[PDB]
Write a protein that binds this ligand. Structure first.
Ligand code: ZN
Ligand code: ZN
Lengths: 101, 30, 253, 154, 89
């Protein structure tokens, strides 16, 4: 007899888009990314140490690359008359960029 | 005398009313 | 505090969690509209809703979180949706047991009936031995041997119930055609004296025997379990025995 | 020092009543033992019953471990469910399983008799009888007394 | 316009009687809407209300528990003439 205030799907998504394009703080949590970086590095040399600045630089580079990739992915998804990005969109973006063979 | 004091003493020593109800259930099985 | 509960809003239920419990006696809440401030009300946060809908609710609008209330909430939802569907359809349509008794007392009561209906006689006005006296003696002497609180409680309840029976059923179905005029005289005297009529202190043991005789239909017209029926039937038979031992004192003319 | 490991350190001194911050008192000794960090040997393990949150000392209800697993612990203070009886005459009594709110509670007229099987709903066809308070008193009273008179009969 | 009975429903005798306005039954002045119809209007033909009042009064009078429902029945049923034990019939 009242109904809660549910925003129509796609509204909070746009609000989040605005919020996260307005800000600059890193979006990936720091500890999980550091653990991932160390695990990946473990396959090239054992008993490696990382300067905190090194992990931060890796995180910034990775986040910037992923954001640019998602921009290209959204462009491809819109090109297909879609609104949802799908793995095929990421694959096409990477293929055109020249990253994926 | 003693009977009219036993259950009143029990309702004190056992405290919690739920424990007293379980006590009465156990008693009623007998 | 903090437990789950169901709360009223309109004709529907909503699950809620209690955040504050208000004690009007001490003027404090454990963690208000005037109409509920006097009584014990509760501040509740509804499950599935924002904090803006938190409110104080009294005992009337709240129910314990049990199976019965959940089922009643489901019934309310079902009837609400049914009503909405019915309203939509209406708009669319607009748009286009046995007892044993000794035979000596049977002869006594048959003689009584002959006296009343065929001999045109009536019981003497307030009797030298009243039913209350009879029941008091029965109770006093039946259990005088020793103290058995439970059995004595049974007997006392039986006697009190028999007294209430007399006082509720004399004017109803314990009188003959001819005794009605005497009953009318008695009630007119009571009205003039401004004293309510109490059959037990006026009518005699013969009418109590009448009551025992008519008991089985009333007992058959109850919700009492089988065991209770057996118990009071046994006690009725014991009373029959005890009064039969005293048949001459109460029924000899 | 954590888990089943509430047996390795005085670390779980938090056998204090969480909700109220008071001390969980065991029903038998009637006290809570925790000693100190400088005398952990004076602490005595305590557990709360899973059914009714009555604290018990592991040394009061003789036990060697916290359950933490398997079934829910039940005090020695609850009523039996299986009442295996020998009079061999191994006659079993089980308490009827809880029924959906089909459940019936047909009210007594009380006093002696009224033989329920064992099912009861204390009140101030699987019919949970509703025995109130004084009926139990009288029923036990006359049971033990009339049994003693029967012994006299012997 | 139901015709009221010419014999008292309590004693089955002809005479001067008061007639109930909701049933054909009529009662003598000495045998006393009837009690049954009064109780019917009170209950409004709702069995759930009947049972709820039944439980309520069974509760309040704990001293006469053994006969509570029959006490009810006295107060809800109209009087009728007394009969000796019909063990024969
Ligand atoms: Zn327990
Ligand atoms: Zn202990």
């Amino acid at each position: 007899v009242k109904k809660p205030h549910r925003y129509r799907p796609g509204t909070v998504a746009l609000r989040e888009i605005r919020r996260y394009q307005k800000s600059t703080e890193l979006l990936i949590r720091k500890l999980p990314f550091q653990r991932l970086v160390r695990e990946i590095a473990q396959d090239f040399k054992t008993d490696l140490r990382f300067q905190s600045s090194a992990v931060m630089a890796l995180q910034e580079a990775s986040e910037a690359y992923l954001v640019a990739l998602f921009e290209d992915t959204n462009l491809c998804a819109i090109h297909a008359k879609r609104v949802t990005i799908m793995p095929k969109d990421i694959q096409l973006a990477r293929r055109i960029r020249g990253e994926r063979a | 005398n003693e009977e009219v004091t036993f259950f009143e003493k029990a309702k004190r020593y056992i405290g919690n009313k739920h424990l007293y109800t379980e006590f009465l259930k156990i008693l009623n099985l007998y | 505090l903090g437990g789950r509960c169901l709360a009223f809003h309109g004709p529907l239920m909503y699950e809620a969690k209690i955040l504050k419990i208000w004690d009007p006696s001490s003027k404090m809440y454990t963690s208000i509209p005037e109409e509920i401030i006097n009584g014990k009300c509760f501040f509740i946060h509804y499950q599935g809703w924002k904090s803006s809908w938190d409110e104080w609710v009294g005992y009337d609008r709240i129910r314990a979180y049990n199976e019965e209330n959940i089922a009643m909430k489901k019934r309310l939802a079902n009837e609400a949706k049914e009503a909405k569907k019915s309203l939509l359809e209406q708009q669319k349509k607009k748009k286009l047991i046995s007892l044993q008794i000794p035979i000596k007392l049977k002869s006594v009561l048959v003689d009584d009936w002959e006296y009343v209906t065929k001999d045109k006689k009536i019981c003497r006005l307030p009797a030298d031995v009243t039913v209350e006296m009879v029941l008091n003696k029965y109770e006093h002497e039946v259990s005088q041997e020793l103290e058995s609180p439970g059995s004595q409680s049974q007997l006392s309840e039986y006697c009190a119930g028999l007294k209430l029976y007399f006082d509720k059923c004399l004017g109803n179905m314990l009188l003959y055609r001819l005794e009605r005029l005497q009953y009318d005289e008695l009630l007119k005297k009571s009205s003039k004296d401004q004293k309510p009529l109490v059959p037990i202190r006026i009518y005699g043991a013969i009418h109590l025997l009448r009551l025992i005789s008519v008991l089985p239909e009333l007992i058959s017209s109850t919700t009492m379990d089988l065991q209770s029926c057996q118990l009071l039937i046994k006690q009725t038979e014991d009373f029959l025995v005890w009064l039969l031992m005293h048949v001459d004192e109460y029924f000899n003319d | 020092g954590q888990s089943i490991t509430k047996l390795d350190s005085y670390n779980p001194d938090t056998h204090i009543d969480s909700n109220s911050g008071k001390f969980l008192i065991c029903y038998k000794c009637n006290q809570t033992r925790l000693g100190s960090w400088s005398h952990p040997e004076n602490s005595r393990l305590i557990m709360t019953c899973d059914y009714c949150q009555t604290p018990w000392h592991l040394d009061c209800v003789p036990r060697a471990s916290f359950k933490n697993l398997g079934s829910k612990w039940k005090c020695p203070l609850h009523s039996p469910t299986k009442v295996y009886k020998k009079i061999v005459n191994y006659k079993v009594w089980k308490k009827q399983r809880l029924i959906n709110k089909n459940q019936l509670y047909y009210e007594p007229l009380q006093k002696i008799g009224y033989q329920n099987n064992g099912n009861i709903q204390i009140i101030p066809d699987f019919k949970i009888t509703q025995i109130d308070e004084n009926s139990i008193k009288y029923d036990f009273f006359d049971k033990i007394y009339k049994s003693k008179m029967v012994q006299k009969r012997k | 316009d139901f015709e009221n009975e010419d014999f008292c429903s309590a004693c089955n005798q002809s005479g001067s009687f008061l007639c109930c306005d909701t049933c054909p039954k009529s009662f003598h002045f000495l045998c006393l809407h009837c009690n049954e119809c009064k109780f019917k209007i009170f209950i409004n033909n709702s069995m759930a209300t009947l049972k709820k009042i039944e439980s309520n009064f069974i509760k309040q009078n704990n001293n006469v528990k053994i006969f509570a429902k029959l006490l009810f029945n006295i107060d809800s049923h109209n009087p009728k003439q007394f009969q000796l034990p019909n063990y024969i019939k």
